[PDB]
C-alpha cells in the first residue's frame, strides 16, 4: 500500500532550550534521549520534464552498523481533508553501503550536503526531533563545519497509512501543549 506523512515545524532560540527539553521530558514517554548525529545528501535527476526527480540519502556517523536510508517525498496535497499539517506521500528504503555509486550510475547528481545534530523523543505514534543544522564546505571532508544560525529547529511528525482521520487533531492538541515556548504551524515549502 501507500503511506502518508503529516508534518509540523517550528524553531526555538538556543538560550532557552533547557526549559523546552525539560518540558518534553515531562510530556513524552518514559525513555531516555538518543542524541543522534547524521550526514545527509540530496540527489537530483534532470530529465525531459520540467520538475526534476529528487531523493534524499542519510547516514549515521555515531553508530556503526546502521544501513543507509533513502527517502522520496512527493508534492503536498491540496485536498481539504486535513488542513492543519503538511500531508505528503513518502517512500522510505533501507539500503546497503554502496548507495552513492549506484545512484550516480543511474544518472543522479549531488546538489548539497549538511550535518544535523540534536535530540529525539517519542510519544505514542508521534516523533519529536529537535536539531541544529550545520554547513559543509570543502565537500570531501566532514570536519569543516560551521553553524548556520542562532536557533534550533523543532519537528513533529506522524507517518500512517492513507485515510486515518482524527490524527491532525491529536497533533494540534500536542502542539498546543507547547504553545508558550514554541509556536508550530503548517507552512508550505515555497518561500
Amino acid at each position: 500500500i501507500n503511506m502518508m506523512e503529516y508534518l509540523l515545524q517550528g524553531s526555538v532560540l538556543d538560550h532557552s532550550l533547557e526549559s523546552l527539553i525539560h518540558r518534553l521530558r515531562g510530556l513524552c514517554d518514559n525513555m531516555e534521549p538518543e542524541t543522534f548525529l547524521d550526514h545527509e545528501m540530496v540527489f537530483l535527476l534532470k530529465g525531459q520534464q520540467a520538475s526534476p526527480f529528487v531523493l534524499r540519502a542519510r547516514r549515521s556517523m555515531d553508530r556503526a552498523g546502521a544501513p543507509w536510508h533513502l527517502r522520496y517525498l512527493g508534492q503536498p496535497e491540496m485536498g481539504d481533508k486535513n488542513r492543519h499539517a503538511l500531508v505528503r506521500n513518502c517512500v522510505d528504503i533501507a539500503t546497503s553501503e554502496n548507495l552513492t555509486d549506484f545512484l550516480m550510475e543511474m544518472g543522479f547528481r549531488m546538489d548539497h550536503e549538511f550535518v544535523a545534530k540534536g535530540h529525539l523523543f517519542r510519544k505514542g505514534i508521534m516523533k519529536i526531533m529537535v536539531y541544529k543544522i550545520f554547513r559543509i564546505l570543502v565537500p570531501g571532508n566532514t570536519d569543516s563545519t560551521e553553524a548556520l544560525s542562532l536557533s534550533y529547529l523543532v519537528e513533529l511528525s506522524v507517518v500512517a497509512p492513507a485515510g486515518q482521520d482524527m490524527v491532525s487533531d491529536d497533533m494540534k492538541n500536542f502542539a498546543e501543549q507547547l504553545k508558550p515556548l514554541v509556536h508550530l504551524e503548517k507552512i508550505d515549502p515555497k518561500r
Binding site: 515545524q9 517550528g10 524553531s11 526555538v12 532560540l13 532557552s16 540530496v42 546538489d111 548539497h112 550536503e113 549538511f114 543544522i133 554547513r135 559543509i136 548556520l148 544560525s149 542562532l150 536557533s151 529547529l153 515556548l181 514554541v182 509556536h183 507552512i187 515549502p189 518561500r191
Partner: peptide, 24 residues
C-alpha cells in the same frame, strides 16, 4: 515577558532544509 523565539529564524531554517538555500 521575555521573548523566546524568532520567526525570521523559522523562515530561514525551513526554507534551508526544504531546499538548499544557504548551503551551496
Amino acid at each position: 515577558n521575555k521573548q523566546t523565539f524568532n520567526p525570521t529564524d523559522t523562515n530561514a531554517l525551513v526554507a534551508a532544509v526544504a531546499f538548499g538555500k544557504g548551503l551551496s
